[PDB]
Design a protein around this ligand. Structure first.
Ligand SMILES: Nc1ccn([C@H]2C[C@H](O)[C@@H](COP(=O)(O)NP(=O)(O)OP(=O)(O)O)O2)c(=O)n1
Ligand SMILES: [Mg+2]
Ligand SMILES: [Mg+2]
Length: 347
DNA sequence: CTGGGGTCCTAGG
DNA sequence: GTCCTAGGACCC
């Protein structure tokens, strides 16, 4: 009788996984990134525990910066296979509730629920938090609404370890005075372009004439931003499996490369690694992109389409190296990367 | 000093 | 109304 979308987001996800094996660290600053050595150059924070975030540490910070901003933190190496495994357990549990479940990356999911009168979406969200914790030792937060975008926005108010409802009744009261980048997919550059037209809040955006937004942003985007400002969004939760569009690997080197021999050999090794992973997942490559970053932090990406979709190793390597060859490589190289775009024709 | 992994969209020769 | 790459803008 009442249709709800619940958005589950795991709490301090990488840190919470680490905390399962180190329960003595609960309540203490913990910082996941690199190899656990905070003096290591060219490594950053992947996840800071809530306690560490109070010192201003946050994902993407250099570990040496972080250690200097939270000297008593315990530094743990990033363990991806453990986060992957913990994700799968989380999705596998959420699926068994008998509601449509749309997974998004490792640590989020949307759930669609049509509730009779006797129930209450808040109490469905508490049994989600309870089932997850009991079975997996992970805490999560749950935002509630009638569309995905607004539920996801609610989840930021539910953090940490909580539940929050955001609907047409409180959308204006709660987020009207907030800047437009409180909305999903509006960031700093859209914000700046909005500020230029005199729009500095959600409520201001919500009442903007459509043709100002359609002229500035396109006839479908401009209306979408209106919709977002008014608290609307996607209402369908599809259980259909996500098909990745690409896969990539990049490596920042412990010291910058100057031998071209080594740059080639690294791109060749990244192309081979990425290809074997997509072939294992049953995929076919369509385009091949190479990324190069110098010691300047000068970074560019070039891409080329295969004549036809293929999985051929010798062809994809030659293509990547060919694309590599289109860069002037007269500066030391800090990073190299390869990305393989993938066919989405027939699964 | 400044990681690694993604998506979606528009500008444009 | 083509088929292509570049790259901006976000996000986890
Ligand atoms: N720049 C970033 C952002 C997130 N991540 C990883 C680490 C996070 O634990 C994971 C989930 O992203 P997230 O949900 O934005 N933050 P997280 O779960 O750590 O904390 P809260 O959701 O409770 O705020 O993606 C990363 O590797 N690099
Ligand atoms: Mg999270
Ligand atoms: Mg998340």
């Amino acid at each position: 009788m009442t249709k709800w979308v619940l958005h589950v987001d795991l709490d301090q996800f990488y840190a919470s996984v680490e905390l399962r094996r180190r329960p003595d660290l609960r309540g203490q600053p913990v910082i996941v990134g690199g190899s656990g050595d905070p003096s290591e150059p060219r490594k950053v924070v992947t996840c800071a525990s809530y306690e560490a975030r109070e010192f201003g540490v946050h994902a993407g910070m250099p570990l040496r910066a972080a250690a200097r901003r939270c000297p008593d933190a315990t530094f743990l190496p990033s363990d991806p296979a453990a986060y992957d495994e913990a994700s799968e357990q989380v999705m596998g549990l959420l699926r068994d509730l008998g509601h449509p479940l749309e997974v998004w990356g490792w640590d989020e999911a949307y759930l669609g629920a049509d509730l009779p009168d006797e129930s209450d979406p808040v109490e469905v969200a508490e049994r989600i938090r309870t089932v997850v914790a009991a079975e997996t030792g992970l805490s999560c937060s749950v935002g509630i609404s009638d569309n995905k975008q607004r539920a996801k926005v609610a989840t930021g108010f539910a953090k940490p370890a909580g539940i929050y409802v955001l609907t047409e009744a409180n959308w204006m009261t709660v987020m009207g005075d907030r800047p437009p980048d409180a909305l999903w997919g509006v960031g700093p550059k859209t914000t700046k372009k909005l500020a230029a037209m005199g729009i500095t809040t959600v409520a201001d955006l919500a009442v903007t004439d459509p043709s100002v937004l359609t002229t500035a942003f396109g006839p479908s985007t401009g209306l979408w931003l209106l919709l977002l400002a008014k608290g609307g969004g996607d209402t369908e939760v599809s259980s259909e499996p996500w098909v990745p569009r690409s896969r990539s690997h990049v490596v920042t080197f412990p010291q910058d490369l100057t031998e071209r021999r080594e740059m080639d050999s690294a791109v060749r090794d990244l192309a081979l690694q990425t290809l074997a992973e997509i072939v294992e997942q049953g995929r076919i490559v369509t385009r091949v992109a190479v990324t190069v970053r110098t010691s300047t932090f000068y970074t560019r990406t070039k891409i080329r389409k295969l004549p036809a979709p293929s999985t051929d190793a010798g062809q994809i390597v030659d293509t990547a190296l060919a694309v590599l060859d289109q860069f002037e490589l007269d500066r030391p190289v800090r990073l190299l990367g390869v990305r393989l775009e993938l066919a989405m024709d027939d699964v």
